């Protein structure tokens, strides 16, 4: 029951993703070097990991069928509030339940609880973040479901500041019904079981993590000496 429009949408988003997610993580070199030794020793590197991921997410968002029909101001609001969430989602690709870490290439760009810890976020965030990663991993989404979920997350009507929330909703709906339908036609049981509802629930887990993140961001950034270790894009996106 996948219409030709819906196969189109999934074609676009797979390609959009492929163009914005290099699975060899080769650019991780242009990032300030990582340091594991250690008072916020990681902050410069991961700050650069996030800033970069921000860029890549924007690049994915622009190709979302319908995102272009939005105003520049609504495009702004949606990206500003989804950015970290979409980074958590896309990060699932490098995360592995082997040692509960994000394994990008190897060691020097393999990140873990104590690594993440050493960048200035507490365990009030990191513990539930990892939990999230474990549950999202276990759903074993089809990559098509992966990219549909990232796009659905970006195009959320309820984000504070939205104007044409109505046209935001229509673009999201088109993507939702595309996901609901894909799961039925392409996801075989038992994996298919309540899969959509379990994905929409990850969106709610994401809001909670974001809220925690936005609180501990205000914390790092109230100390200029920390704010001074970030990138300008991170400053601009996470509110300045």
């Amino acid at each position: 029951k996948l219409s030709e429009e819906q196969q189109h949408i999934i074609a676009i988003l797979l390609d959009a993703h492929h163009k914005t997610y290099d699975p060899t993580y080769a650019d991780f070199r242009d990032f300030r070097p990582p340091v594991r030794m250690s008072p916020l020793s990681m902050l410069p590197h991961l700050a650069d990991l996030v800033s970069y991921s921000i860029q890549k997410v924007i690049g994915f968002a622009k190709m979302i069928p319908g995102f272009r029909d939005l105003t520049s101001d609504d495009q702004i609001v949606l990206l500003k509030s989804s950015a970290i969430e979409v980074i958590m989602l896309r990060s699932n690709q490098s995360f592995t339940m082997d040692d509960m870490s994000w394994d990008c290439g190897s060691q020097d760009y393999k990140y873990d609880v104590t690594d993440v810890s050493k960048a200035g976020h507490t365990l009030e965030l990191i513990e539930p973040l990892i939990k999230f990663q474990v549950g999202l991993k276990k759903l074993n989404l089809h990559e098509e479901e992966h990219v549909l979920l990232m796009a659905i997350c970006i195009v959320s009507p309820d984000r504070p500041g939205v104007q044409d929330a109505k046209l935001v909703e229509a673009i999201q709906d088109r993507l939702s019904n595309t996901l609901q339908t894909y799961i039925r036609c392409r996801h075989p049981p038992p994996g298919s079981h309540q899969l959509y509802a379990k994905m929409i629930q990850k969106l709610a887990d994401l809001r909670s993590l974001n809220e925690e993140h936005s609180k501990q961001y205000r914390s790092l950034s109230f100390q200029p000496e920390n704010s001074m270790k970030l990138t300008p894009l991170v400053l601009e996106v996470f509110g300045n």
Partner: peptide, 11 residues
């Protein structure tokens, strides 16, 4: 807030 660089990456 006027976001220069986000605006530039979206255009």
């Amino acid at each position: 807030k006027n976001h220069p660089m986000l605006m530039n990456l979206l255009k």
